[PDB]
Amino acid sequence: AYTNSFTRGVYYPDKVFRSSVLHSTQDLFLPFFSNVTWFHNPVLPFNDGVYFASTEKSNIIRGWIFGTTLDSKTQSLLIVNNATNVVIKVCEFQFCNDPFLGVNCTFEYVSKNLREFVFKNIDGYFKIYSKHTPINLVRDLPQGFSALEPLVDLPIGINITRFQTLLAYYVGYLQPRTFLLKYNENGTITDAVDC
Amino acid sequence: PVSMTKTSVDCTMYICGDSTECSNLLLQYGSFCTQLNRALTGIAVEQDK
Amino acid sequence: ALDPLSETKCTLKSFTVEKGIYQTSNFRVQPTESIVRFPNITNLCPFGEVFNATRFASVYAWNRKRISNCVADYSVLYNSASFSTFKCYGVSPTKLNDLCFTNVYADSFVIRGDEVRQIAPGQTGKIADYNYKLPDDFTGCVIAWNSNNLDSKVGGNYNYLYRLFRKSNLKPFERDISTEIYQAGSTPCNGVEGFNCYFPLQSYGFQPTNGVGYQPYRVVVLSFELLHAPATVCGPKKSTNLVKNKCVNFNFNGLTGTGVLTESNKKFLPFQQFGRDIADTTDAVRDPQTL
Ligand SMILES: *[C@@H]1O[C@H](CO)[C@@H](O[C@@H]2O[C@H](CO)[C@@H](O)[C@H](O)[C@H]2NC(C)=O)[C@H](O)[C@H]1NC(C)=O
Ligand SMILES: *[C@@H]1O[C@H](CO)[C@@H](O[C@@H]2O[C@H](CO)[C@@H](O)[C@H](O)[C@H]2NC(C)=O)[C@H](O)[C@H]1NC(C)=O
Ligand SMILES: *[C@@H]1O[C@H](CO)[C@@H](O[C@@H]2O[C@H](CO)[C@@H](O)[C@H](O)[C@H]2NC(C)=O)[C@H](O)[C@H]1NC(C)=O
Ligand SMILES: *[C@@H]1O[C@H](CO)[C@@H](O)[C@H](O)[C@H]1NC(C)=O
Ligand SMILES: *[C@@H]1O[C@H](CO)[C@@H](O)[C@H](O)[C@H]1NC(C)=O
Ligand SMILES: *[C@@H]1O[C@H](CO)[C@@H](O)[C@H](O)[C@H]1NC(C)=O
Ligand SMILES: *[C@@H]1O[C@H](CO)[C@@H](O)[C@H](O)[C@H]1NC(C)=O
């Protein structure tokens, strides 16, 4: 299944404040009006970066796995939100062929709806941006525009080329595109142009 | 149109803003700094004229 | 530099200045003080875990603790008076506070006093050969202090062991924990002790009455690592007080400059650190300690 990435997958590329200005920036973004793969939990590549989105009514999706082999051989990322707490670990975990949830750890951290995330892995840093929005749609991604603020920057230095999800959702692949971003008075990105 | 904006630039401060190592290197280039100031000053006086 | 007319004369390279107005110099306010601001020190490295450990490992089975993703306060160590040996090779302790590293390894073990000398680059002996070897290019610190009060008891503490025989010398940071019967002769032992068949390990005699040379010493060896990865072990990088409405030389988390810092009315987003102008010029910051 495939759907249209209308204007989604814009994130603040840097931590800089800018107001009432159009700034041109080259980085890994989700190309406008591209094909996003639609899923109702296989293993997917991580070419240079991933745009994940999930439409949720009951918070079925919980986590992500990232790495190269993801079979207790090498370092791999596991990210999990369990009902109250977020957990991140980078152990060489022994995963099942079809891991899920019921109804050498070199790092550890503990903390109707659309949840959009961007994962990218640059200079050994794992950058995670996200945005939560209310929606009234059961078919596909809402058309419109909203920016993703960074949430986490993990200094892992771990090679990732593949990933998988842990529980419907959509996947897009980022590309090195130049964008023009419109920052309003409040420093929020309100519109963008794919150059 | 009759006049422009009478801009002036301090070459030193532009190139080597508040840096001593940079300034000492810049001295080796001679009068570039001075001649740019001089040219722009020329422009500004022309604007008034 | 006598008087402005002289500055003029020098600028024009003449003794005779014609009537006019001459641009001679450039007025620039000098910064009065230096401001350094970094975020509140948080997530200290677990040095306590290693130094304040209740029990230590034997030298042949020396413990290795990995230190990562934390702020390493070396001051608490090199300013402490609890250490007899604080030797650092190819690095100064004080400087460590200004440095980041990918990984730090705290190798902890116990030896006798006279063997402390073997824990150094280019040393030989039972310890340096069969138990714990430092590389010739070691660039870390060795900390050792007497532990007679803890690791000695009336009648002799024999919990601490050392390897007495080995078929070859250890490589730098090699760990051998094998208990294979040492074949001193030509006859295979087949895991049976006897003539030319000896157990490779032996106990230390740690009594409170023992000579300082034979008294137990706790040793921590800090090794510093720079990989193809982010440096996650950094020093405290101490801050200063903040001064407003003055020309200052400021340093915020990454960025330096010179200016006058004033109360702004800008509305940064919770994640935005420093603001910019049209001309990609830093115009505003967020103080890391006070938002
Ligand atoms: C989510 O799972 C995590 C672990 O995967 C749970 O975190 C642990 O909580 C207990 C009790 O507070 C602690 O003793 C552990 O140290 C925690 N683990 C870690 C890794 O720090 C957490 O309790 C779970 N969430 C909920 C809501 O129960
Ligand atoms: C920036 O955000 C602020 C706060 O949400 C907005 O300021 C408010 O604007 C409304 C409508 O003019 C006023 O009723 C409020 O009194 C304002 N509040 C404050 C605290 O100033 C502002 O409109 C936003 N600007 C943009 C461009 O989005
Ligand atoms: C950094 O640490 C300082 C000192 O503990 C914190 O300053 C306090 O801030 C609160 C809230 O504004 C004030 O009520 C207190 O008066 C401050 N304490 C002192 C001793 O002056 C500050 O909040 C911390 N900031 C961060 C980002 O961690
Ligand atoms: C992109 O999506 C359209 C509409 O679903 C489809 O016809 C086309 O084959 C897709 N492109 C690729 C490269 O698969
Ligand atoms: C644990 O990870 C480290 C990473 O440097 C690696 O060197 C080591 O071989 C791993 N240990 C095991 C037992 O797999
Ligand atoms: C990541 O993969 C590339 C390409 O295979 C390889 O050159 C590099 O060594 C890998 N990184 C690590 C840390 O092993
Ligand atoms: C060990 O604890 C004592 C207080 O009981 C303290 O003086 C010392 O600083 C601690 N060790 C380290 C390495 O901080």
XYZ file of C-alpha atoms and ligand atoms in Angstrom:
675
model
C 0.000 0.000 0.000
C 1.122 3.562 -0.842
C -0.110 7.068 0.062
C 0.801 10.703 -0.600
C 3.241 12.600 1.629
C 1.522 15.932 0.963
C 3.514 18.449 3.042
C 4.554 16.289 6.008
C 8.081 15.577 7.275
C 9.323 19.071 8.043
C 11.424 19.400 11.193
C 13.538 22.189 12.673
C 16.929 21.303 11.164
C 18.804 23.211 13.897
C 18.282 24.659 17.368
C 18.353 28.263 16.111
C 15.602 30.797 16.726
C 14.478 32.756 13.667
C 11.406 34.980 13.351
C 9.434 36.367 10.386
C 12.019 35.165 7.841
C 12.455 32.637 5.032
C 15.525 30.482 5.553
C 16.992 28.139 2.943
C 18.593 24.963 4.351
C 19.882 21.715 2.860
C 19.285 18.572 4.942
C 17.495 15.210 4.968
C 13.783 15.919 4.609
C 10.790 13.977 3.387
C 10.231 15.038 -0.273
C 6.814 16.633 -0.757
C 4.121 14.595 -2.526
C 6.220 11.423 -2.336
C 5.144 7.800 -1.855
C 4.897 6.643 1.745
C 4.617 2.913 2.369
C 1.450 2.051 4.313
C 1.329 -0.776 6.849
C -1.490 -2.258 8.921
C 5.523 -5.668 11.542
C 8.204 -6.500 8.866
C 11.851 -5.309 8.811
C 12.427 -2.127 6.765
C 15.682 -0.462 5.578
C 17.003 2.803 7.045
C 18.609 4.208 3.908
C 19.703 7.606 5.314
C 16.704 8.431 7.492
C 13.091 7.536 8.201
C 9.837 9.381 8.571
C 7.468 7.333 10.658
C 3.856 8.212 11.302
C 1.143 6.436 13.227
C -2.587 6.995 13.494
C -3.696 5.869 16.933
C -6.957 5.470 18.838
C -5.714 2.994 21.486
C -1.881 3.392 21.436
C -1.192 -0.008 19.812
C 2.334 0.892 18.591
C 4.842 1.102 21.455
C 8.403 0.969 20.159
C 11.130 0.640 17.531
C 14.185 -1.525 16.930
C 17.154 -0.310 14.880
C 20.470 -1.801 13.777
C 22.159 -3.978 11.141
C 21.394 -7.583 12.141
C 19.101 -7.159 15.191
C 19.851 -10.767 16.254
C 22.001 -10.728 19.433
C 25.251 -10.393 17.395
C 26.061 -6.671 17.587
C 24.870 -3.347 19.048
C 21.277 -2.376 18.235
C 18.848 0.275 19.496
C 15.656 -0.550 21.319
C 13.145 2.183 22.131
C 10.011 1.391 24.147
C 7.183 3.380 25.705
C 5.308 1.309 28.320
C 2.159 3.118 29.556
C 4.016 5.674 31.744
C 7.737 5.411 30.923
C 10.080 5.640 27.925
C 13.075 3.271 27.843
C 16.063 3.432 25.498
C 18.870 0.844 25.433
C 21.666 -0.127 23.018
C 22.383 -3.719 24.140
C 23.207 -6.531 21.703
C 19.692 -7.875 22.357
C 18.420 -11.346 21.384
C 15.188 -10.515 19.535
C 12.454 -12.904 18.363
C 11.700 -13.341 14.628
C 8.359 -11.580 15.299
C 8.811 -9.536 18.548
C 5.755 -7.769 20.042
C 3.927 -6.759 23.230
C 0.879 -8.381 24.874
C -2.413 -7.000 26.252
C 26.539 -5.468 26.645
C 24.385 -2.348 27.343
C 26.568 0.697 26.453
C 23.697 3.189 27.147
C 20.368 3.254 29.036
C 17.813 6.080 29.479
C 14.413 6.075 31.261
C 11.699 8.804 31.111
C -8.058 10.451 16.620
C -4.319 11.025 17.214
C -1.473 11.380 14.760
C 2.068 10.869 16.027
C 4.815 11.757 13.534
C 8.494 10.964 14.100
C 11.736 11.428 12.210
C 14.744 9.230 12.956
C 18.120 10.029 11.450
C 21.643 8.956 12.196
C 24.351 11.511 11.527
C 27.994 11.550 12.753
C 27.093 8.804 15.246
C 24.289 10.926 16.725
C 20.789 9.492 16.645
C 18.372 12.374 16.252
C 14.686 11.892 17.001
C 12.099 14.597 16.202
C 8.365 14.223 16.775
C 4.972 15.904 16.822
C 1.579 14.971 18.257
C -1.589 16.295 16.613
C -5.371 15.696 16.928
C -7.014 14.383 13.728
C -10.417 13.285 12.376
C -9.540 10.810 9.590
C -9.443 6.930 9.403
C -8.095 6.616 5.774
C -4.660 8.242 5.422
C -2.396 11.145 6.479
C -4.193 14.514 6.910
C -3.277 17.146 4.321
C -1.824 20.280 5.918
C 1.389 21.502 7.517
C 3.079 21.161 10.927
C 6.727 21.076 12.024
C 8.482 18.476 14.193
C 10.503 19.715 17.168
C 13.526 17.617 18.262
C 13.008 15.391 21.301
C 16.194 13.375 21.696
C 19.834 13.306 20.610
C 21.568 10.038 21.502
C 25.394 9.866 21.214
C 25.460 6.181 20.221
C 27.857 5.950 17.239
C 25.920 2.800 16.237
C 25.589 1.803 12.561
C 21.915 1.454 11.544
C 20.792 0.183 8.119
C 17.531 -1.540 9.090
C 14.709 -1.169 11.610
C 11.305 -2.543 12.660
C 8.227 -1.541 14.680
C 6.848 -2.966 17.945
C 3.097 -2.900 18.732
C -1.481 1.094 11.266
C 1.396 3.400 10.290
C 3.343 4.909 7.363
C 7.013 4.971 6.453
C 8.853 7.479 4.290
C 12.507 7.781 3.418
C 14.376 11.057 3.836
C 16.563 12.494 1.096
C 19.106 15.356 0.909
C 16.797 18.141 -0.294
C 17.085 21.913 -0.085
C 14.099 23.487 1.641
C 12.904 27.009 2.192
C 11.242 27.400 5.588
C 8.990 30.257 6.719
C 9.533 31.126 10.373
C 6.744 33.327 11.814
C 6.972 35.931 14.628
C 7.108 33.153 17.243
C 9.947 31.295 15.501
C 7.583 28.471 14.441
C 7.838 26.999 10.924
C 4.468 27.641 9.287
C 5.190 26.905 5.630
C 7.904 25.350 3.502
C 9.002 24.941 -0.103
C 10.700 21.906 -1.593
C 13.242 23.543 -3.902
C 18.028 58.213 -8.368
C 20.500 60.675 -6.973
C 22.370 59.205 -4.036
C 23.233 55.903 -2.409
C 23.746 54.861 1.185
C 27.078 56.231 2.393
C 28.395 52.910 3.687
C 31.820 52.539 5.297
C 33.612 49.326 6.369
C 36.503 48.685 8.765
C 38.372 45.984 6.819
C 40.249 44.924 9.954
C 37.126 44.399 12.018
C 35.378 42.764 9.061
C 38.114 40.213 8.433
C 39.609 39.668 11.860
C 36.812 40.680 14.227
C 38.463 41.115 17.679
C 41.290 38.619 17.027
C 44.976 39.429 17.451
C 46.492 36.437 15.612
C 44.275 37.183 12.635
C 45.182 40.897 12.651
C 48.926 40.163 12.787
C 48.547 37.914 9.741
C 46.480 40.555 7.977
C 49.291 43.109 8.367
C 51.298 41.047 5.877
C 48.891 41.992 3.068
C 49.902 45.638 3.314
C 47.623 48.430 2.231
C 44.599 46.428 1.016
C 42.856 47.420 4.201
C 43.644 51.121 3.777
C 42.787 51.304 0.101
C 39.355 49.740 0.622
C 38.508 52.291 3.328
C 39.763 54.994 1.001
C 37.665 53.827 -1.961
C 34.458 53.648 0.061
C 35.153 57.071 1.553
C 35.464 58.305 -2.033
C 32.034 56.865 -2.788
C 30.441 58.470 0.263
C 31.791 61.920 -0.511
C 30.564 61.548 -4.104
C 27.083 60.806 -2.772
C 26.976 64.091 -0.874
C 28.266 65.907 -3.918
C 49.803 59.255 19.343
C 50.552 62.566 21.093
C 47.345 64.332 19.966
C 44.611 63.830 17.303
C 46.265 66.275 14.915
C 49.357 64.046 15.110
C 47.255 60.937 14.363
C 45.993 62.877 11.340
C 49.520 63.838 10.284
C 50.646 60.213 10.583
C 47.635 58.938 8.619
C 48.240 61.354 5.744
C 52.051 60.914 5.962
C 52.464 64.694 5.988
C 53.405 67.549 8.289
C 50.898 69.881 6.635
C 47.240 68.966 6.945
C 44.911 70.963 4.677
C 41.530 72.071 6.074
C 39.028 69.193 6.147
C 37.810 66.238 8.185
C 39.918 63.097 8.211
C 39.016 59.636 9.381
C 42.052 58.602 11.417
C 41.233 55.766 13.771
C 38.527 53.369 14.921
C 36.985 53.652 18.380
C 36.120 50.233 19.892
C 34.970 49.556 23.464
C 37.060 46.828 25.084
C 35.254 44.021 26.998
C 35.657 44.398 30.774
C 35.197 40.751 31.767
C 34.743 37.192 30.554
C 31.454 35.332 31.007
C 31.396 31.550 30.695
C 28.045 29.768 31.013
C 27.413 26.035 30.711
C 24.417 23.964 31.936
C 24.237 22.861 35.576
C 26.595 19.937 36.178
C 24.508 16.758 36.054
C 25.028 12.992 35.624
C 28.326 12.676 37.397
C 30.459 9.641 36.547
C 30.219 6.819 39.150
C 33.733 7.161 40.584
C 32.359 6.226 44.028
C 31.325 2.794 42.688
C 34.983 2.064 41.871
C 37.013 3.845 44.581
C 34.463 3.284 47.379
C 33.885 -0.359 46.311
C 33.630 -2.636 49.381
C 35.573 -5.485 47.737
C 38.205 -5.432 44.987
C 39.154 -8.081 42.427
C 42.387 -10.112 42.406
C 45.135 -8.772 40.111
C 44.891 -11.845 37.822
C 41.120 -11.210 37.511
C 41.225 -7.386 37.644
C 37.782 -5.762 37.268
C 37.057 -3.423 34.381
C 34.383 -0.773 34.778
C 33.382 1.173 31.681
C 32.594 4.877 32.152
C 30.498 6.607 29.484
C 27.877 9.332 28.964
C 28.636 11.327 32.129
C 30.591 14.287 33.535
C 33.908 13.220 35.095
C 34.900 15.299 38.102
C 38.634 14.581 38.337
C 39.128 17.358 40.924
C 37.596 15.134 43.655
C 40.447 12.701 42.899
C 43.676 14.680 42.338
C 42.817 17.082 45.212
C 42.048 14.184 47.586
C 44.697 13.290 50.178
C 43.611 9.630 50.340
C 45.925 8.485 47.526
C 49.610 7.596 47.884
C 50.168 7.146 44.133
C 48.470 9.388 41.561
C 50.702 8.928 38.517
C 49.556 10.092 35.065
C 51.432 9.451 31.829
C 51.085 11.609 28.701
C 48.341 13.613 30.441
C 47.934 15.989 33.404
C 44.994 15.343 35.811
C 44.070 19.035 35.898
C 43.814 19.160 32.090
C 41.359 16.226 32.114
C 38.560 18.645 33.082
C 38.924 20.332 29.670
C 38.855 17.092 27.683
C 36.182 14.716 26.428
C 36.613 10.993 25.694
C 34.453 8.285 24.138
C 35.084 5.798 26.927
C 37.027 5.612 30.178
C 38.064 2.294 31.703
C 38.602 1.953 35.456
C 40.633 -1.222 35.981
C 40.469 -2.043 39.705
C 42.535 -4.647 41.593
C 44.700 -5.231 44.676
C 48.448 -5.892 44.865
C 51.144 -5.660 47.537
C 53.036 -2.358 48.055
C 56.377 -3.320 46.430
C 54.515 -4.399 43.255
C 52.863 -0.958 42.759
C 55.967 -0.032 40.709
C 55.042 -2.794 38.191
C 51.866 -0.841 37.313
C 53.565 1.511 34.845
C 54.584 1.464 31.136
C 57.653 -0.680 30.311
C 57.720 -2.617 33.581
C 58.626 -6.307 34.076
C 57.883 -8.890 36.816
C 55.179 -11.390 37.883
C 52.452 -8.695 37.817
C 53.524 -6.870 34.629
C 54.005 -10.207 32.823
C 51.292 -12.615 33.990
C 48.629 -10.503 35.740
C 48.273 -7.000 34.305
C 50.312 -5.373 31.535
C 50.303 -1.686 30.655
C 51.253 -0.629 27.088
C 54.506 1.323 26.504
C 52.333 4.173 25.077
C 49.813 4.151 27.975
C 48.108 7.564 28.253
C 46.002 7.273 31.418
C 46.314 7.500 35.207
C 47.317 5.006 37.910
C 45.922 5.558 41.399
C 46.990 3.420 44.356
C 46.421 3.668 48.095
C 47.175 1.452 51.097
C 44.273 -0.823 52.074
C 45.848 -2.546 55.107
C 42.813 -1.494 57.195
C 40.401 -3.245 54.768
C 42.215 -6.051 52.918
C 44.204 -7.418 55.868
C 42.901 -9.367 58.861
C 44.404 -11.156 61.880
C 45.584 -14.556 60.600
C 46.071 -13.426 56.975
C 43.681 -12.599 54.139
C 44.226 -15.010 51.235
C 41.196 -13.984 49.121
C 43.516 -11.959 46.833
C 45.452 -14.063 44.281
C 48.129 -13.560 41.604
C 49.214 -15.658 38.607
C 52.659 -17.170 39.255
C 53.174 -19.124 35.987
C 52.253 -18.523 32.331
C 53.464 -19.909 28.965
C 53.966 -16.299 27.675
C 53.861 -12.647 28.844
C 50.495 -10.828 28.701
C 49.654 -8.301 25.966
C 48.630 -4.769 27.120
C 45.216 -4.895 28.873
C 45.036 -8.667 28.403
C 43.056 -10.560 31.055
C 43.858 -14.235 31.758
C 41.562 -15.914 34.323
C 42.375 -19.545 33.308
C 43.194 -22.114 36.055
C 44.810 -24.667 33.646
C 47.606 -26.700 35.342
C 50.954 -25.210 34.217
C 53.119 -27.763 32.345
C 56.628 -26.811 33.608
C 58.158 -29.951 31.970
C 57.746 -32.167 28.864
C 55.062 -34.431 30.458
C 51.411 -33.402 29.764
C 49.547 -32.798 33.075
C 46.021 -33.523 31.656
C 44.609 -31.325 34.482
C 46.530 -33.362 37.131
C 48.987 -31.581 39.481
C 52.343 -33.152 40.437
C 55.988 -33.113 39.268
C 56.360 -30.185 36.786
C 52.540 -29.741 37.068
C 51.655 -26.708 39.251
C 48.531 -24.570 39.838
C 49.111 -21.220 38.027
C 47.763 -19.007 40.874
C 48.884 -18.253 44.466
C 47.455 -16.231 47.411
C 48.745 -13.023 48.960
C 49.654 -13.046 52.658
C 47.876 -9.912 53.920
C 48.209 -9.549 57.705
C 47.874 -6.156 59.528
C 51.393 -6.719 60.924
C 52.940 -7.193 57.446
C 55.644 -4.863 56.106
C 54.377 -1.848 54.114
C 55.959 -3.549 51.061
C 53.762 -6.619 51.661
C 50.685 -4.675 52.852
C 47.647 -4.598 50.483
C 47.218 -1.660 48.089
C 44.053 -0.919 46.095
C 44.818 0.186 42.528
C 42.576 1.874 39.956
C 43.899 2.388 36.431
C 42.050 4.920 34.295
C 42.433 4.460 30.528
C 41.069 7.045 28.087
C 39.603 6.095 24.722
C 38.986 8.081 21.532
C 37.017 6.010 18.992
C 35.066 6.667 15.794
C 32.152 7.714 18.056
C 30.926 10.793 20.036
C 32.927 11.706 23.139
C 30.489 11.086 25.998
C 32.850 11.460 28.971
C 33.579 15.129 29.509
C 35.032 17.226 32.320
C 32.953 19.646 34.462
C 33.798 22.809 32.402
C 33.033 25.258 35.241
C 30.832 28.338 34.678
C 30.966 31.928 36.003
C 28.410 34.553 37.069
C 26.445 36.462 34.395
C 26.861 40.226 33.843
C 24.351 42.363 31.920
C 24.511 45.798 30.244
C 28.313 45.678 29.841
C 30.707 44.947 26.988
C 31.857 41.404 27.770
C 33.552 38.412 26.238
C 30.817 35.764 26.524
C 30.952 31.988 26.023
C 27.669 30.028 25.905
C 27.513 26.250 25.451
C 29.441 26.099 22.172
C 29.614 29.702 21.010
C 31.876 32.617 21.820
C 31.502 36.313 21.125
C 31.846 39.849 22.419
C 28.856 42.064 23.124
C 26.389 43.603 25.552
C 23.895 41.132 26.983
C 20.477 42.628 27.743
C 17.072 41.345 28.862
C 15.286 40.381 25.639
C 11.537 40.265 24.904
C 11.976 37.466 22.327
C 9.946 34.235 22.645
C 12.219 31.285 21.897
C 10.683 27.830 21.598
C 11.446 25.414 24.496
C 14.117 23.700 22.375
C 15.667 26.787 20.699
C 19.054 27.635 22.177
C 20.288 30.715 20.361
C 18.630 33.140 17.980
C 19.828 34.497 14.663
C 19.537 37.604 12.503
C 18.696 37.859 8.785
C 22.452 37.858 8.152
C 23.049 34.482 9.916
C 24.386 36.520 12.851
C 23.832 35.461 16.488
C 21.549 38.104 17.988
C 20.200 36.382 21.116
C 20.962 33.394 23.358
C 19.338 31.299 26.061
C 21.406 31.146 29.269
C 21.993 27.378 29.808
C 21.555 27.609 33.615
C 18.583 29.987 33.588
C 16.054 29.703 30.803
C 8.468 0.175 31.957
O 9.551 -0.757 31.927
C 10.687 -0.317 32.682
C 11.868 -1.270 32.483
O 11.871 -1.815 31.157
C 10.308 -0.185 34.160
O 11.364 0.534 34.824
C 11.844 -0.083 36.038
O 11.056 0.279 37.175
C 11.459 -0.354 38.395
C 10.520 0.090 39.515
O 10.480 1.519 39.603
C 12.920 -0.033 38.727
O 13.355 -0.831 39.835
C 13.840 -0.293 37.536
O 15.146 0.222 37.821
C 13.287 0.354 36.271
N 14.093 0.002 35.109
C 15.116 0.735 34.654
C 15.750 0.237 33.388
O 15.517 1.749 35.206
C 8.992 0.569 34.378
O 8.523 0.302 35.706
C 7.902 0.195 33.372
N 6.801 1.147 33.436
C 5.743 1.019 34.244
C 4.723 2.115 34.137
O 5.594 0.088 35.021
C 2.686 34.032 19.278
O 2.087 33.368 20.392
C 1.406 34.264 21.278
C 0.793 33.468 22.429
O 0.018 32.371 21.931
C 0.337 35.094 20.554
O 0.064 36.244 21.377
C -1.328 36.404 21.714
O -2.081 36.915 20.613
C -3.486 37.020 20.863
C -4.178 37.516 19.595
O -3.589 38.745 19.148
C -3.756 37.943 22.055
O -5.145 37.898 22.402
C -2.925 37.542 23.272
O -3.040 38.549 24.284
C -1.455 37.355 22.901
N -0.718 36.852 24.053
C 0.516 37.252 24.391
C 1.084 36.617 25.627
O 1.159 38.075 23.756
C 0.752 35.571 19.157
O -0.416 35.920 18.409
C 1.543 34.510 18.393
N 2.047 35.041 17.135
C 2.116 34.326 16.002
C 2.695 35.031 14.809
O 1.748 33.164 15.914
C 20.406 25.204 37.670
O 20.706 25.244 39.066
C 20.281 26.427 39.735
C 20.788 26.369 41.175
O 20.270 25.217 41.850
C 18.761 26.552 39.651
O 18.409 27.849 40.167
C 17.172 27.894 40.908
O 16.067 28.190 40.055
C 14.811 28.243 40.734
C 13.694 28.396 39.704
O 13.903 29.571 38.911
C 14.831 29.388 41.748
O 13.606 29.412 42.491
C 16.001 29.236 42.718
O 16.132 30.436 43.491
C 17.318 28.953 41.997
N 18.311 28.501 42.963
C 19.369 29.218 43.363
C 20.271 28.530 44.347
O 19.617 30.349 42.967
C 18.263 26.398 38.213
O 16.838 26.253 38.212
C 18.888 25.193 37.502
N 18.538 25.203 36.087
C 18.521 24.106 35.320
C 18.168 24.326 33.878
O 18.785 22.988 35.740
C 3.821 6.159 -6.343
O 2.422 6.055 -6.047
C 1.563 5.940 -7.182
C 0.113 5.975 -6.702
O -0.129 4.922 -5.761
C 1.892 4.660 -7.952
O 1.111 4.592 -9.151
C 3.375 4.618 -8.310
O 3.699 3.332 -8.853
C 4.244 4.887 -7.082
N 5.648 4.985 -7.461
C 6.546 4.006 -7.276
C 7.952 4.336 -7.686
O 6.274 2.913 -6.801
C 30.800 -6.015 24.177
O 30.903 -4.846 23.359
C 32.246 -4.411 23.148
C 32.227 -3.086 22.393
O 33.540 -2.515 22.376
C 33.010 -5.492 22.385
O 34.381 -5.104 22.233
C 32.939 -6.833 23.115
O 33.471 -7.861 22.272
C 31.508 -7.193 23.512
N 31.511 -8.327 24.428
C 30.949 -9.516 24.169
C 31.060 -10.536 25.267
O 30.374 -9.783 23.124
C 29.431 0.967 9.480
O 29.326 0.371 8.185
C 30.345 0.793 7.268
C 30.066 0.187 5.893
O 29.943 -1.237 5.988
C 31.728 0.401 7.798
O 32.747 0.979 6.974
C 31.930 0.866 9.239
O 33.118 0.269 9.772
C 30.737 0.500 10.118
N 30.873 1.089 11.444
C 31.310 0.425 12.522
C 31.321 1.211 13.801
O 31.673 -0.742 12.500
C 34.110 7.915 48.971
O 33.233 8.324 50.023
C 33.814 9.282 50.917
C 32.798 9.643 51.996
O 32.373 8.463 52.686
C 34.260 10.536 50.161
O 35.105 11.322 51.011
C 35.013 10.225 48.864
O 35.100 11.426 48.088
C 34.330 9.117 48.059
N 35.129 8.743 46.899
C 35.070 9.381 45.723
C 35.972 8.852 44.645
O 34.342 10.340 45.515
